[PDB]
């Protein structure tokens, strides 16, 4: 983005990463690095120690802290001390944390200089107009009994893995695929992500997936018309490159993470079809009824309603009985799915060795 | 074809007809007619033995009127040989003509200048020359005759200066004969020529024989470091149908952009989601007739 | 130069020429020694098969309409390949359009 | 692909009489309307008139 | 081609070539081997 938008030379630009560690030889320029590399208190390599010596010994004029919400962390905090910068600009979309340490940014970086009005940007067309909805999935009797008679870690997986959310997600996938939408289905639970993806015949990307397979699946999502839905784990929340998406379905979440909720909303807020009149992107949060997921979903949406978004509650999807292939409709298959969810949890001497 | 190609063809034809024999004329005219030509092709057209074309090809290569390519192919009978292709390199050939005729003029000037210094003398007994500068070291005591240093014989007069007018006449007769050459050089230096090679020369080939063992397809190697227009004519009646089809596509766009029911209207009150013209035209025709009476092997495939 | 070239037909060398002024258009292949003359009338041509420039041996296949008729033209230079295939593609596009619109009419 | 209606091609007919003279001696004698229009649209005459 | 201009004549030839010339990793998405397509270009 620097080399594209501004008249900065590649000889004036430098990158401090694992593969790239050479620095600019001019008297001034650009260096882009990561918080973990800068604040790595571990025993770093000699050349990276030399680069850190260069960064510390130079008096920097400007620092851009991208995703400044992670700055108040335990030792991401010290990157504003180890780098003596005259000006510090923290750029973010999600200025929330689930602890009270978000207010330490007034002492780390500075005061809250600017907040964008997301509704004003949406009505000016700078970001997409999203229809935020919360889809209530009533649990079955057997899954609710098992949800009551388990501890919290099994309870999480058991309200995620209910068949009603399978049916609602499958119906929404079919409906928006008929409408011609690029759909991202976010779920932090890896087992739930894989089970939904194998049940629905759509590709899934999570942490242990190889990078070449991830790039191939993302290219298929961007260009292939038969691949209109991708299932993403928490790899999709962090700043990775994603294709243009207009529909999003949130199956599971990481407790009441408002930052993750707004980061998921941001993946569809930048849709290309904003210039089309009457276009609307769609956000769905599929939540099991009468569980702690409702509590966590309200906690997550508390930040998005501060931005102006209204989450319409959907207790009924018209067409849930007319869908031909409904996942886990039969009681015997529901019992089988319950059983799977419950059963989830001197050089010569060297030849000896 | 191209006018500069015509001029260089006539220049090569003129120089091979002037400074070269008839067999050279035949070979170079075959090269100018068929753009590339292998040895069997020259044999088939000209009925010329390999030993007879030997001096011909050797002279034409040593003057660079033609050049050779050493490409071997793979015929279906697998009796491949490293055959040779003969073609013409137009810019190198014309540059060779300019250099040859230019330096020929240069040492013709040198020869007439050497004639233009006075003749000197030569000794008939020893067959050695002695110019006027060193003959005066060899004059006698009687101061009348130049005597040879070895033979002791009176030096006789040479003829370097009596033939100066003859050399000037020969120069003139060379020039008026080579006037077409210089005119062609002026035209091809005023205009711009394409530097052709074997690969370029394959483009305008007229083939020489049917059962040719020489295959003109080029074989590239690695490691050597030495659209369509379609129309839609309509009778202006189906254009209304096409406008209707574009309107149709507009309402499928409307259902692409349509707001869903569960977003447009509240879902609280609903249940929880879970498991005859022919004959009257004949009468018109009859009435019109009555009125008128009243006035009266498989390989790669590509979709191209 | 665009309508003339050298090619190999049935492992026999000859000259390919485009007769476009005549209706219907023709490709005439003449044997250089006068042994034979092959003609292709372009109205009864369905499709053309070509080979990419990465391929070594250059074939051009003509498939006609009614057992379909198949013709093979072995080529030598890529410029002859290019101009022959683009002239042929344009004229068979015109003839296909004419056949389709006469069927529709 | 391009769309050619009757009023459209007639508009070519009055605004360019040279195309009309090309039509008259060619379409009932040698070759037909769609391939004639393809030849004309691929010709230099269309570019020079445009 | 580079001596004709030394001699003063215009060289019709350019200087020749003699003077100065030059994985597959593992797939986790095993349920659509053959449904996804390769995209080496945009
Ligand atoms: Zn003597
Ligand atoms: Zn060198």
From Swiss-Prot, chain A:
Localization (cell): Nucleus
Renumbered ranges of motif DEAH box: 66-69
Domain of life: Eukaryota
Disruption phenotype: Essential, it cannot be deleted; epistasis studies suggest it is involved in damaged DNA excision repair.
Residue stretches making up the Helicase C-terminal domain: 167-321
Phosphoserine: residues carrying this PTM: 330
Residue ranges occupied by any Helicase ATP-binding domain in the UniProt entry: 1-113
Record function comment: ATP-dependent DNA translocase. Component of the general transcription and DNA repair factor IIH (TFIIH) core complex. When complexed to CDK-activating kinase (CAK), involved in RNA transcription by RNA polymerase II. May have 3'-5' helicase activity alone, the TFIIH core however has no 3'-5' helicase activity. Also involved in transcription-coupled nucleotide excision repair (NER) of damaged DNA. In NER, TFIIH acts by opening DNA around the lesion to allow the excision of the damaged oligonucleotide and its replacement by a new DNA fragment.
Other noteworthy facts: Present with 825 molecules/cell in log phase SD medium.
Record's subunit section: Component of the 7-subunit TFIIH core complex composed of XPB/SSL2, XPD/RAD3, SSL1, TFB1, TFB2, TFB4 and TFB5, which is active in NER. The core complex associates with the 3-subunit CTD-kinase module TFIIK composed of CCL1, KIN28 and TFB3 to form the 10-subunit holoenzyme (holo-TFIIH) active in transcription. An additionnal subunit, TFB6, plays a role in the dissociation of the SSL2 helicase from TFIIH after transcription initiation. Interacts directly with TFB6.
Family of this protein: Belongs to the helicase family. RAD25/XPB subfamily.
Protein name, as recorded: General transcription and DNA repair factor IIH helicase/translocase subunit XPB/SSL2
Source organism (scientific name): Saccharomyces cerevisiae (strain ATCC 204508 / S288c)
Gene from which the chain derives: SSL2
From Swiss-Prot, chain B:
SUPFAM superfamilies: Zinc beta-ribbon (SSF57783)
Keyword terms of this UniProt record: Metal-binding, Nucleus, Transcription, Transcription regulation, Zinc, Zinc-finger
PROSITE patterns: HTH_TFE_IIE
Compartments, as annotated in UniProt: Nucleus
CC annotations in GO: mitochondrion; nucleus; transcription factor TFIIE complex; transcription preinitiation complex
InterPro entries reported in the protein's UniProt record: TFE (IPR039997), TFIIE/TFIIEa_HTH (IPR017919), TFIIE_asu (IPR002853), TFIIEa/SarR/Rpc3_HTH_dom (IPR024550), Znf_RING/FYVE/PHD (IPR013083)
Main location: nucleus
Pfam family, one: TFIIE_alpha
Location of region: Disordered: 243-264
Subunit structure, interactors included: TFIIE is a tetramer of two alpha (TFA1) and two beta (TFA2) subunits.
Family, per entry: Belongs to the TFIIE alpha subunit family.
Additional observations: Present with 35900 molecules/cell in log phase SD medium.
Protein name: Transcription initiation factor IIE subunit alpha
Species this protein is from: Saccharomyces cerevisiae (strain ATCC 204508 / S288c) (Baker's yeast)
Swiss-Prot record, chain E:
Highest rank taxon of the organism: Eukaryota
Cysteines joined through disulfide linkages: none
Coiled coil: none
Subcellular location as annotated: Nucleus
Note: Present with 1150 molecules/cell in log phase SD medium.
Subunit structure comment from the entry: TFIIE is a tetramer of two alpha (TFA1) and two beta (TFA2) subunits.
Similarity field: Belongs to the TFIIE beta subunit family.
Role of this protein: Recruits TFIIH to the initiation complex and stimulates the RNA polymerase II C-terminal domain kinase and DNA-dependent ATPase activities of TFIIH. Both TFIIH and TFIIE are required for promoter clearance by RNA polymerase.
The protein's name: Transcription initiation factor IIE subunit beta
Shown residues in whole-protein numbering: 275 to 327 of 328
């Amino acid at each position: 983005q620097f080399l594209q938008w501004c008249t900065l030379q590649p000889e004036n630009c430098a990158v401090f990463t694992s593969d790239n560690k050479e620095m600019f030889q001019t008297e001034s320029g650009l260096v882009v690095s990561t918080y973990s590399m800068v604040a790595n208190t571990r025993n770093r390599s000699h050349d990276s120690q030399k680069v850190m010596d260069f960064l510390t010994g130079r008096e920097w004029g400007f620092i851009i802290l991208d995703e400044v919400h992670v700055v108040p962390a335990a030792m991401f905090r010290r990157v504003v001390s180890t780098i003596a910068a005259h000006a510090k600009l923290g750029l973010t979309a999600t200025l929330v944390r689930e602890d009270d340490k978000i207010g330490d940014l007034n002492f780390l970086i500075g005061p809250k200089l600017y907040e964008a009005n997301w509704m004003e940007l949406s009505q000016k067309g700078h970001i997409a107009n999203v229809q935020c909805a919360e889809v209530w999935c009533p649990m079955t009797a057997e899954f609710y009994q098992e949800y009551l008679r388990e501890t919290a870690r099994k309870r999480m997986l058991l309200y995620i893995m209910n068949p009603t959310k399978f049916q609602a997600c499958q119906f929404l996938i079919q409906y928006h695929e008929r409408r011609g939408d690029k759909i991202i289905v976010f779920s932090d639970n890896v087992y739930a992500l894989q089970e939904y993806a194998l049940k629905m015949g759509k590709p899934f990307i999570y942490g242990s997936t190889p990078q070449q397979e991830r790039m191939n699946i993302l290219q298929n999502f961007q260009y292939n018309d038969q691949i209109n839905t991708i299932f993403l784990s928490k790899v999709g929340d962090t700043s990775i490159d994603l294709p243009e998406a207009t529909c999003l379905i949130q199956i599971s979440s990481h407790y009441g993470s408002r930052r993750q909720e707004a980061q998921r909303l941001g993946r569809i807020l930048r849709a290309k079809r904003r210039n089309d009149e009457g276009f609307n992107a769609f956000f769905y949060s599929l939540v099991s009824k009468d569980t702690q997921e409702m509590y966590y979903s309200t906690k997550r949406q508390a930040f998005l309603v501060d931005q102006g978004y209204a989450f319409k509650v959907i207790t009924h999807l018209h067409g849930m009985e007319n869908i031909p292939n409904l996942a886990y409709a039969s009681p015997r298959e529901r019992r089988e799915l319950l059983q799977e969810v419950l059963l989830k949890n001197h050089p010569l001497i060297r030849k000896m060795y | 074809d191209r006018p500069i190609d015509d001029i260089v063809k006539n220049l090569l034809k003129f120089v091979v007809r002037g400074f070269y024999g008839g067999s050279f004329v035949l070979v170079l005219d075959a090269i100018l007619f068929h753009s590339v030509l292998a040895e069997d092709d020259l044999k088939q057209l000209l009925s010329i033995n390999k030993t007879e074309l030997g001096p011909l090809i050797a002279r034409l290569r040593s003057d660079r009127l033609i050049s050779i390519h050493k490409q071997r192919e793979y015929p279906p009978n697998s009796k491949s040989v490293e055959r040779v292709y003969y073609y013409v390199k137009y810019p190198h050939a014309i540059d060779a003509i300019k250099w040859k005729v230019h330096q020929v003029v240069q040492r013709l000037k040198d020869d007439l200048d050497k004639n233009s210094e006075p003749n000197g003398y030569m000794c008939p007994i020893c067959l050695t020359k002695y110019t006027q500068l060193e003959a005066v070291q060899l004059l006698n005591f009687d101061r009348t005759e130049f005597l040879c240093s070895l033979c002791d014989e009176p030096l006789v007069e040479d003829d370097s200066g009596k033939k100066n007018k003859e050399k000037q006449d020969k120069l003139n007769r060379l020039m008026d004969q080579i006037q077409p050459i210089i005119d062609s050089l002026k035209k091809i230096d005023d205009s711009r020529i394409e530097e052709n090679t074997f690969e370029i020369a394959l483009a305008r080939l007229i083939p020489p024989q049917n059962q040719s063992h020489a295959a003109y397809t080029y074989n590239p190697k690695k490691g050597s470091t030495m659209a369509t227009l379609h129309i839609n004519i309509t009778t202006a009646s189906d254009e209304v149908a096409q406008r209707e089809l574009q309107e149709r596509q507009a309402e499928e766009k409307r259902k692409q952009n349509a707001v869903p029911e569960w977003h447009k209207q509240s879902t609280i009150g609903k249940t929880a989601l879970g498991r005859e013209e022919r004959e009257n035209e004949k009468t018109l025709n009859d009435y019109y007739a009555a009125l008128a009476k009243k006035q009266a092997l498989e390989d790669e495939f590509e979709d191209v | 130069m665009s309508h003339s070239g050298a090619a190999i037909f049935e492992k026999v060398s000859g000259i390919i020429a485009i007769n476009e002024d005549v209706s219907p258009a023709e490709l005439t292949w003449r044997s250089t020694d006068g042994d034979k003359v092959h003609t292709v009338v372009l109205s009864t041509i369905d499709k053309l098969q070509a080979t990419p420039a990465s391929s070594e041996k250059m074939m051009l296949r003509l498939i006609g309409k009614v057992k379909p008729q198949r013709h093979m033209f072995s080529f030598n230079n890529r410029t002859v390949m290019d101009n022959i295939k683009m002239t042929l593609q344009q004229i068979i596009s015109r003839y296909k359009d004419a056949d389709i619109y006469e069927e529709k009419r | 692909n391009v769309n050619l209606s009757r009023e459209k091609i007639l508009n070519i007919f009055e605004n360019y009489p040279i195309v009309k003279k090309a039509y008259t001696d060619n379409v009932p004698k040698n070759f037909k309307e769609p391939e004639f229009w393809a030849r004309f649209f691929s010709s230099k005459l269309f570019r020079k008139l445009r | 081609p580079r001596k004709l201009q030394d001699l003063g004549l215009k060289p019709a030839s350019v200087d020749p070539a003699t003077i100065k010339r030059q994985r597959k990793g593992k797939i986790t998405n095993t349920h659509m081997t053959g449904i996804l397509k390769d995209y080496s270009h945009r």
